[PDB]
Symmetry: C6
């Protein structure tokens, strides 16, 4: 909350973006330890081959969904943290002894859009959609021929995937709108 206030921030940055960020954190907290907790423990494969459970789970879930969203939240909150430290350093220096603050705030908004877009593209490149399947067919060594494996709680995981994707998409649109608001105001 505190690390989201600047003298150049409009109502969108002060209120709407801050609420959405808290919204994403709260959803992640209640859906991490309980929904994705038994992702590998309850991954069931119809085989007797030792080691087939480990390789098939790793093949279809190279990075867990919750770990991807945790990384995205850390990355998109970094520019806000950097700006806050710069403000304190400048405020300390000014007392001791647009402008520079305008460029730092504008640059932070640009990097927030880039990080938001990159992480959802990684999601689509890696899981080709939001729908978690009930069944995965795995043929990696040492599994003989093709082995059927069953995912844990596919429906609940799909529901939370739609929530995070929808909020992340809204966050980019708000960030894009704020970038346009600042640019046109200084230009015209």
């Amino acid at each position: 909350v505190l690390g989201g206030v600047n003298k150049h921030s409009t109502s969108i940055g002060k209120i709407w973006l801050t609420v959405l960020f808290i919204f994403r954190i709260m959803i992640l907290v209640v859906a991490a330890e309980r929904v994705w907790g038994d992702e590998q423990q309850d991954f069931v494969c119809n085989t007797l081959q030792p080691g087939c459970r480990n390789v098939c789970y790793d093949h279809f879930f190279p990075i867990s969904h919750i770990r991807l969203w945790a990384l995205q939240l850390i990355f998109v909150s970094t520019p806000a943290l950097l700006v806050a430290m710069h403000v304190a350093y400048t405020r300390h220096e000014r007392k001791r002894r647009r402008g520079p603050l305008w460029w730092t705030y504008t640059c932070s908004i640009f990097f927030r859009i880039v990080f938001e877009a990159v992480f959802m593209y990684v999601f689509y490149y890696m899981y080709d959609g939001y729908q978690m399947p009930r069944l995965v067919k795995c043929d990696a060594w040492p599994c003989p021929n093709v082995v059927d494996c069953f995912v844990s709680r596919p429906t609940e995981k799909t529901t939370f995937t739609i929530f995070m994707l929808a909020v992340s998409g809204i966050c980019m649109m708000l960030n894009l709108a704020e970038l346009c608001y600042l640019v046109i105001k200084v230009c015209l």
Copy 2:
């Protein structure tokens, strides 16, 4: 508590709604990790088919009850959080340099009613009542014919479902009463 006080709020909003919100949170905290902890682990099905446990549990419990209530609490508390930030932003601007505060508070009450009603309808659309069955009959692939499966702690889960439904219904009535109090006062 703090994010529930406005200069247009009556006694109902200041006291009764705040207590009920804390009441729902406290009940959720004591009944989440212990009552719904072993929902899938102690889901027992009378079969030898691999993967039948995963598909049958996911078929009858697409979203866990506690996750639905956690989502509802987050949604119904969002309008209160939005109003508080708007007050601080307006208070900061007024010093730096009915009305707008009346409309923001009135709009937040309307959205609280909508979110409360939507989540209760979703519950009845998804679980068709408050009574958790002891036995569920599942015929989804790969389960052969119809398989008997047994739920964990059905009676305790039914009791807490009644508590959350009753308090949610009371909270909707109180919000409706406060909305009527403000409308008639300004009209007459």
Copy 3:
């Protein structure tokens, strides 16, 4: 502690009731996650029938003892919380612009007695005493004929049941004494 002080409260309400409430909370904290943790996991039944463990445990323990005490503590502390908010609202209004405070405090004491009495009656209606048995005989479907099942830590659970029942009984007596003290003082 703070939510237990009013200008009409005598020494009993200020000191003895506050200490007993903290006493009940402390006992519950140390005896919840460790004594009742494995209530169903270590519930052993002498049978080969799938699903008999789930139905027999649910039949004899419809609501866990710790969950009943947690609900009781929440209920008996609600009237105290309601009084505190009313005091703050009245104190704010008086500055901005017996009596009403006497009736609110008296009413809160009455509801504390009712909630205390109701929860112990529910305990006796549901578990017909304080002694937890070592053996339960269960004949609910699908268990064939009558099945022997064995409870986890029956002696330790009996000891803590006596503690909570005794303190709850003492708390009801103290509340009754305080109610009589206020009534006779105003009457005579």
Copy 4:
């Protein structure tokens, strides 16, 4: 720490008793969840009789050691908490409008000795010493004849039992010394 200071307390009550109380809490914290965590889970009995593990563990450990020490700490800290509230109530009343404080402090010391002595006598009546055996022989129904059962971590549990017994014995001696110091001073 704060709830252990009174205007009639000598150096023993202010310093030595406070340090010992913190000493007992710290030892309990590091030795509860890890040493006694698997007391029943790793209780191994040489039998095939269902339910023999539950009844034999309950017969030889009716109350766990850590739960007994947790109860003792709660009881012996109650008189200190009662005195603190009485001081605040008297201090508030005096401003609003030996002696009584001397008797309350003296009575609290007496009850601390009684609670300390009662809990160790219960320990000796219940476990007849400090040495935890490696083997227990159990003949309670339904165990056939006599069944050998093996305790988890008997040596480590014995070591911590000696620590708590030694500190509890020292605490009584300090409390007894403080009681004698106050009595003779007022008498002579």
Copy 5:
């Protein structure tokens, strides 16, 4: 944050190094209990020999990755903690009664580089790269001949290894730049 500010610190030390340190801590928190939690529990070996799982896991993972990073963070933050205490001690002494502060800050930067370099060399000496294999072949006694063992979540562990190595490399470069900035300024 507080233990990273000195009167001789430039913008790099005040802002960039502080953010990166928080960045490394945040990544470690979200990836410790969930990614490396089941490292040995889900270590599957294709054998019937008792004890082969323990010796093969210990042979290939003598120190866990998360424990190595936790040790590195503790070591690289020690010089900053030492400087802060020296500042407070000097500040207290000066009131009671370049220079010495310049040498202490310069020395702390040097030790941060050394600790950073040592821990990455230990990583390459011990795990000869960043890629975690799916399969390990173990022939330590008592495993007969050569036994195949399978690692848990090799792909996710590889991804986080790249993140920590990259940030640690960046932190070493920033520390080197700050050291050069101070040396040339005092020299010329």
Copy 6:
């Protein structure tokens, strides 16, 4: 930190000893719940005898390594806590109404050395070195003849044992140096 400052403390006690104490606590926190968590659970013995796992683990690990270090930290921090309370009691008395503070500080240093040496001797008397074996041969009843048992994570446990022993040895040397500094200063 606060409980390590006295008016007679030199730079060694104020800075170096405080940092080392925090250093030992931080290492213990990250290496307790994860490295020693499965000490008995993953203790594997090559036998079919019931109860042999319990007696052999208890024979070779009478007290866990982490519990020994936790006890040592509590003991060596007690004299520092005792001194702080004595300072506050003396400071309160002086206002109400070398020297004594010099002897209390000197005595606390002496007891810190004794406790540090005693716990290190107990470690060598009990585990005869820092190297944890991979294999232990156990012949206690009821294990028939000699049974092979395998330790969990012996290499990682050895590494952390060296760390704690090295820091404890350094802490003893620093305490000895500070004791010599005070004695010679007062003598000459």
